[PDB]
Design a protein around this nucleic acid. Structure first.
Lengths: 659, 659
RNA sequence: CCCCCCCCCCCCCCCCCCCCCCCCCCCCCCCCCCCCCCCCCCCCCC
């Protein structure tokens, strides 16, 4: 049991408490053990404990003397025990506890008054118990109790007198999840002095019982009310009438299989700010369905509509001016839906929208016409997600109405076209554009001429074509910092492609075909496309098939810190190639054909590093090529993973396999 | 001008005849030179010449004294000269010549009698001349002349008196190709004593002029008659009436753009044995169209039918019982056609067929039903070709009627199915089966159980599946000698796949994935699937990705002569692996990772060879690994191509690039 | 004999990620052949 400040005995197969520990220990963890009983005679030495986790054990019963030896104990964790018997003296001397977790204790019934003797308890948990009533005592106690759990119990009814013991208690979290509760008594929730949160998740209520609960919850200080997986199939206008007299701010209806949402149902929630309806089966949405929610600031509709069926083609249709009431909506999630498309008035009325997500939200939004996003003209949208919508074509002025757009994601689509440059018109504040994993893209001389403020440009695995045009397509991108052109099988690159991009920091060119551009036999000479990038930090050149590196390629990367050259065919490197890399930190040369590591080339590179990866290289165990390398390895501070497992010699055969 | 027995001066830019040659030279070749004139005063030394080729020169005129110095001259080759003037004395002293080629001499008119003085001439050529008449003299000469060319001339008519000089001459080949001849005179061909062959290729005759020619050719000893590219658009029953009185055996109508073949047209050729109709545009074939050809032994119909057109879908249709008259047909070529398919009576009546080719002959023969080849039941067919017919499915008993089939070719198709084994039923005499370049094949335990006599089996690039069944699919193939399983990406092979195939000689397994089966870390041990093949001769294992070879793999290949292991990842080979290869002749190890060549492993292999290919290997210039190799290279007889260009050292760097 | 609670260990299935090897298709470049066209120089014939 290793212990420097806290003691851990997780999965150590301990049966009895250890007797050799420092006296000043604060936390004693004995989880996942086989302690049948816990005598208090062995806790004389341990008198400074604050947290005592004895969960996941076979403890049957305890004794009052246990708390005598722990006067400063604050956490008494008894998760998943066999403690099914409680008495007044069980927690008598214990009064400074701030947590008492008793989950899966198989407690049947609270007998008289076990929790009276403590008053500073903050959190109490009784989940996975056999309790059938919520009574926890006779008189009033647990004044400072903030949260209480009763989930996974056998409670069938809630009586007012059962919770009368909390007449002066502020319950910030009252869990009643997974309870077979079907009856509500008048004034049951009014017994609690300060009620802030309810969680009736996985409780089969139904519209009638939900309406009764809403009526019973009227005129209280409730703040959060979650009804997840409540089997709330249908909603009526009077279902949430009782919530009018409250100040509810967060509501949840997730996984309720809500077949139809009623008309003007949520008119009684003027103070609602957070709304959750994900994973539902709404078939039709009415214009006045969302009436009265003019204060919500967060709406979640992930998979909130019914999925398409070939039997009837029942596509969930959203009526026009549906969101005209959500004036204060600022975050809208609508992923994993099957909406037929965007109409001329689908998003009208959203005057505060800031984040709209439509990932996999449409059955087939193949063409982005200039009138597709007309409804978002008055929405100051900043981040728009359109991934996995099977978009195949983008027309001119597609995003003309999104003047405030900053982040645009069009990846994971089938966008196949040529960027004429007018597709991005109207994006005066765009910063990041994602176009990776498309069908095919064809760049022109003015593909990005209308987005001079762009900073990120991801074009990974998009089959780039005509990137070697005489005018560089990235010339207008003066503020570009991150550029990704990987997995495009790029073959020809002009030497002026990256000219003028002094602010470029991360450049990815892995999984391309640029071997010919660096060979000295290339007609016209080697292509030096890595000149002037004084601010380059991360350079990735994996799987480019390079056979030789010209001497003056890295002559300008003074601020380079991470350089990747793995999976190439490098065999020999010219001397004085890493002198300019005075701030290098990580070097990657795995799976190459390097045989000699000399201080002529790797000297300045290995001046001071943090990572080094040259694992799968056929090194040569010779005094003129490996002596300096092993001498540097002997005394250094750089981290070399798998140094003795993969840095192996191949030649000569006398030293074949020798590290 | 190198010369050991004959003299060659081809493209040597010679202007005058050389004067330093052996006297006993027999052949003097001066082709492609710039000899303006050929004086006979320089031929005093050369008196033993037999063949004198002065073709492709600028010779203008000759003198009779030239033949005086060459009494034993037999070939006087004067191809492509400016000799446009002839006289009686030009070929006076020349009498022992057996060949006189005068093509492209720009001869306008034969004046009086230039060919009288010789009588032993055999071959005479006058192609590409400006002759307008066939007169070659006044009296009769050239008694022993066997062939004569008049192609590419300016002849417009053929008169009987023009060829009267051959009253006692046997012309075995009379070329009149590319002649604008439009008039035929009576008795023109009867002047020649023995006429055996005519070649009117590329002569625009037409049906009427063709009929006139046939009438004029009646009652002669003609044997071959070719009318290739004669613009014979249409044929009538009376077109070839005149050929009845002859004994014609070979006829040609190739490239005639024959739109329609007449009914009962060829009834006048009872002795025809060879028939050519390739590259025609026949649209409809009648049942009685081929009547009277009961003696033809070779029919060619390559692209003899019109191609399909989307405008009208005019697929060339063949009437039933079309070939019922060709009783003696033994070789039928019908490639590059667009026949809709095979009917129930397409090939009925062919009782002597031995070779049927249907490569790219059908528009879409997708399914080979059991009734597809019903017409071939009575044909003793031996070789059948069905390549490039886009066959996609084969049913049971497809080849049940082909009991005499020996070679079957089904490659270059889209055959995708699983071989249940009944597809080959009825092939009791099959020897070779070609199935390469199909869509996908799935083998079972009894895929080839009905073909025990098979000897060749090509399955190259067919995407073989389930080849690793517990019963080897090749078990019934006891007589199998050549097996091809390359380019199938085979991954798993059982050790008993080739058990019982002692007669296997050529085995191909290149472009597969068998690296795991030979690694010593493979669960269950390495797979020794090359045991018992004592008669194996050619072994091909290219691009299998092998990393190590178990010692006892080649312990049984005593008769192995050619072994291929290139394009693999071999780095080191265990000692005593090539001892059993006592009859090895060719070793291939190119593009591997071999670094050391030691006599422990390569000793017995290099005992006596003819070829060695270890070019693109990273050798190691060390006294313990390359000294024996270079010593063996210094004194040996094996052919090592590109020894000084690609056998280069890579390590140590002091000897980097040194051969 | 029954219903539950753990700790340890051994298997089965599914999903995700990564590595090795290989095939097919396509892209970039180079080389070797065949055909056609153009241009330049020189030598002849009518």
């Amino acid at each position: 049991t290793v212990s420097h400040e806290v003691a851990d005995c997780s999965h150590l197969k301990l049966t009895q408490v250890p007797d050799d520990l420092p006296t000043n220990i604060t936390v004693l963890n004995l989880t996942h053990n086989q302690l049948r009983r816990l005598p208090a005679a062995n806790f004389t030495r341990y008198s400074q404990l604050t947290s005592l986790d004895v969960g996941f054990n076979t403890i049957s019963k305890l004794e009052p003397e246990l708390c005598q030896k722990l006067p400063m104990l604050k956490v008494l964790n008894l998760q998943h025990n066999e403690l099914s018997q409680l008495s007044d003296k069980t927690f008598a001397f214990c009064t400074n506890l701030t947590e008492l977790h008793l989950m899966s204790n198989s407690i049947q019934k609270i007998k008289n008054n076990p929790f009276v003797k403590q008053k500073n308890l903050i959190t109490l948990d009784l989940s996975h118990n056999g309790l059938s009533s919520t009574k926890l005592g006779t008189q009033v106690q647990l004044e400072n109790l903030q949260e209480l759990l009763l989930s996974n119990n056998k409670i069938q009814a809630l009586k007012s007198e059962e919770l009368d013991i909390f007449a002066n208690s502020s319950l910030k979290k009252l869990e009643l999840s997974s309870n077979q509760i079907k009856e509500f008594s008048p004034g049951c929730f009014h017994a609690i002095g300060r009620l802030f949160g309810l969680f009736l998740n996985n409780v089969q209520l139904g519209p009638s019982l939900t309406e009764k609960l809403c009526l019973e919850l009227a005129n209280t200080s409730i703040r959060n009310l979650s009804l997840s997986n409540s089997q709330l199939s249908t909603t009526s206008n009077t279902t949430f009438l009782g919530l009018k007299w409250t100040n509810l701010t967060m509501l949840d209806l997730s996984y309720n299989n809500l077949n139809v949402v009623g008309n003007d149902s949520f008119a009684w929630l003027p103070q609602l700010e957070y709304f959750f309806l994900e994973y539902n089966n709404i078939q039709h949405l009415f214009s006045h369905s969302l009436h009265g929610l003019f204060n919500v600031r967060y709406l979640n509709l992930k998979r909130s509509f019914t999925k398409q069926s070939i039997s009837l083609a029942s596509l969930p249709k959203i009526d026009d001016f549906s969101f005209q009431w959500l004036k204060c909506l600022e975050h809208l999630n609508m992923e994993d839906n099957d909406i037929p498309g965007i109409k001329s008035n689908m998003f009208t009325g959203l005057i505060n929208l800031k984040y709209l997500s439509l990932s996999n939200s449409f059955t087939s939004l193949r063409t982005l016409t200039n009138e597709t996003f007309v409804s978002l003209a008055h929405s100051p949208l900043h981040i728009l997600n359109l991934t996995k919508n099977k978009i195949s074509k983008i027309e001119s002025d597609a995003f003309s109405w999104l003047g405030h757009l900053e982040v645009l994601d069009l990846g994971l689509n089938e966008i196949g076209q040529e960027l004429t440059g007018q597709e991005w018109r109207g994006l005066e504040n765009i910063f990041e554009i994602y176009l990776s994993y498309n069908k095919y893209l064809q760049l022109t001389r003015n593909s990005f001429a209308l987005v001079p403020s762009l900073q990120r440009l991801m074009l990974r695995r998009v089959a780039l074509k005509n990137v070697d045009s005489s005018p560089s397509p990235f010339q207008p991108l003066r503020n570009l910092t991150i550029l990704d052109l990987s997995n495009n099988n790029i073959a020809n690159i002009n030497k002026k492609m990256l000219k003028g991009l002094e602010k470029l920091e991360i450049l990815d060119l892995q999984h391309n075909n640029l071997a010919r551009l660096w060979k000295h036999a290339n007609p016209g000479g080697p292509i030096y496309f890595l000149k002037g990038l004084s601010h380059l930090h991360i350079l990735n050149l994996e799987s480019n098939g390079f056979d030789e590196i010209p001497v003056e390629v890295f002559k300008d990367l003074f601020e380079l810190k991470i350089i990747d050259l793995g999976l190439n065919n490098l065999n020999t490197l010219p001397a004085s190639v890493f002198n300019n890399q005075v701030s290098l930190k990580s070097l990657n040369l795995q799976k190459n054909l390097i045989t000699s590591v000399e201080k002529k080339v790797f000297g300045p590179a290995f001046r001071n590093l943090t990572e080094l990866d040259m694992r799968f290289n056929p090194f040569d165990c010779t005094c003129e090529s490996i002596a300096w390398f092993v001498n540097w390895i002997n005394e250094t501070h750089t981290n070399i993973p798998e140094l003795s497992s993969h840095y192996l010699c191949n030649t000569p055969p006398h030293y074949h396999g020798f590290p």
